Amino acid sequence: GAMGSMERASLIQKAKLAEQAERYEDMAAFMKGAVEKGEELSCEERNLLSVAYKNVVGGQRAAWRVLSSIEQKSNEGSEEKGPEVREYREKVETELQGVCDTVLGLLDSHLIKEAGDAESRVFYLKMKGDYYRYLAEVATGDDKKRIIDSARSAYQEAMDISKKEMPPTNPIRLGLALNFSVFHYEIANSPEEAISLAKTTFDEAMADLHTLSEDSYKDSTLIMQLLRDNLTLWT
């Protein structure tokens, strides 16, 4: 890899600089290089990895949605405009799939298999579910069902560990439940499951807030508010 000659610590330092400069493609390349050193990642490093790729794929998803909407309008009384909209939507889609495959490849080689603590293992399995979910958003072929089931399976394994090993207010556990609820609503055509999961997650977190410091309370309630916002949109 092009980062093979750079020290691990320098890659992490430069990822932090890239974040400050809003250079998320660079940030992701630095963090990929750091993962490829073969050592496990600390909590801060795991979050740097996620921030970088979430920003990269987030821009791709936003662009894909714009282009997909234009394409769908073109396929209604609509003047034929040639293959260009489809071609360019396909170009962005292929790039997005490539980023998702890269993240999934890092998780499979070898972040998940070396992650034994709940905070690392749940984090990575959640990420696996997320990037399969992003693949599912653009999937249409003989693979859509299998991609959806791969997302579901990763989220389910993460959920099972999180419920056994983490308190209901743990921010990773909350973010996982939030994203699995989004999977149910937006991917799996299961709005009732989404609503039930969001409600139970919110209520069980509410009942555990009394155990938390001021700073942890702030962290947990911020994520709980997203559960509440979705419940307001969904009901």
Partner: peptide, 9 residues
């Protein structure tokens, strides 16, 4: 309107 997923810190 699309559902809200987990946000960065």
């Amino acid at each position: 309107v699309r559902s809200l997923s987990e946000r960065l810190m």
